[PDB]
Amino acid sequence: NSNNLDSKGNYNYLYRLFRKSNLKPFERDISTEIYQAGSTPCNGVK
Amino acid sequence: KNIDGYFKIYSKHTPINLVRDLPQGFSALEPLVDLPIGINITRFQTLL
């Protein structure tokens, strides 16, 4: 537990909630592009 | 070679004399260095 260390409130900790494919072992991905959950191309569109 | 971000290098040096074809002789390269590169390489370019 790191509540006494990481909890200020604190929100600078993020996780990837959406990705089109699952990551492989010991793999990382820092992609910033808007997740296209539908057929609509979200090229900057929200 | 590269596997799981662990890039391996092998090498060999031999005196030879041929114009354009590779030598017919048989030889084995030996492991040189391994680093956790952490990049799944799909492109490269030799620098001159």
From Swiss-Prot, chain A:
Which residue ranges does the record annotate as region Immunodominant HLA epitope recognized by the CD8+?
10-18
Tell me the outcome of changing residue 40 to K: In strain: Delta/B.1.617.2, Omicron/BA.1, Omicron/BA.2, Omicron/BA.2.12.1, Omicron/BA.2.75, Omicron/BA.4, Omicron/BA.5, Omicron/BQ.1.1, Omicron/XBB.1.5, Omicron/EG.5.1
Record text on subunit structure and interactions: Binds to host ACE2. RBD also interacts with the N-linked glycan on 'Asn-90' of ACE2. Cleavage of S generates a polybasic C-terminal sequence on S1 that binds to host Neuropilin-1 (NRP1) and Neuropilin-2 (NRP2) receptors. Interacts with host integrin alpha-5/beta-1 (ITGA5:ITGB1) and with ACE2 in complex with integrin alpha-5/beta-1 (ITGA5:ITGB1). May interact via cytoplasmic c-terminus with M protein. May interact (via N-terminus) with host bilirubin and biliverdin, thereby preventing antibody binding to the SARS-CoV-2 spike NTD via an allosteric mechanism.
Region annotation (Receptor-binding motif) maps to 1-46
Q: Which residues of the full protein are shown?
A: 437 to 484 of 1273
Q: Would you tell me the protein name for this molecule?
A: Spike protein S1
This chain's source organism reads Severe acute respiratory syndrome coronavirus 2
Q: In the UniProt annotation, what is the result of changing residue 45 to A?
A: Increased resistance to neutralizing antibodies
The top of its lineage is: Viruses, Riboviria, Orthornavirae, Pisuviricota, Pisoniviricetes
The record describes the protein's role as:
Attaches the virion to the cell membrane by interacting with host receptor, initiating the infection. The major receptor is host ACE2. When S2/S2' has been cleaved, binding to the receptor triggers direct fusion at the cell membrane. When S2/S2' has not been cleaved, binding to the receptor results in internalization of the virus by endocytosis using host TFRC and GRM2 and leading to fusion of the virion membrane with the host endosomal membrane. Alternatively, may use NRP1/NRP2 and integrin as entry receptors.
Question: Region labeled Disordered — which residues?
Answer: 17-46
Curated annotation (Swiss-Prot), chain B:
Q: Which domain of life is it from?
A: Viruses
| Protein's organism | Severe acute respiratory syndrome coronavirus 2
Effect on the protein of changing residue 28 to V: In strain: 20A.EU1
Glycosylated where? 40
- In UniProt terms, what function does this protein have? Attaches the virion to the cell membrane by interacting with host receptor, initiating the infection. The major receptor is host ACE2. When S2/S2' has been cleaved, binding to the receptor triggers direct fusion at the cell membrane. When S2/S2' has not been cleaved, binding to the receptor results in internalization of the virus by endocytosis using host TFRC and GRM2 and leading to fusion of the virion membrane with the host endosomal membrane. Alternatively, may use NRP1/NRP2 and integrin as entry receptors.
Effect ascribed to mutating residue 21 to G: In strain: Beta/B.1.351
Please state which portion of the whole protein this structure contains, as first and last residue out of the total length: 195 to 242 of 1273
Tell me, how does this one assemble?
Binds to host ACE2. RBD also interacts with the N-linked glycan on 'Asn-90' of ACE2. Cleavage of S generates a polybasic C-terminal sequence on S1 that binds to host Neuropilin-1 (NRP1) and Neuropilin-2 (NRP2) receptors. Interacts with host integrin alpha-5/beta-1 (ITGA5:ITGB1) and with ACE2 in complex with integrin alpha-5/beta-1 (ITGA5:ITGB1). May interact via cytoplasmic c-terminus with M protein. May interact (via N-terminus) with host bilirubin and biliverdin, thereby preventing antibody binding to the SARS-CoV-2 spike NTD via an allosteric mechanism.
**Outcome (variant: residue 19 to G):** In strain: Omicron/BA.2, Omicron/BA.2.12.1, Omicron/BA.2.75, Omicron/BA.4, Omicron/BA.5, Omicron/BQ.1.1
Q: What is this protein called?
A: Spike protein S1
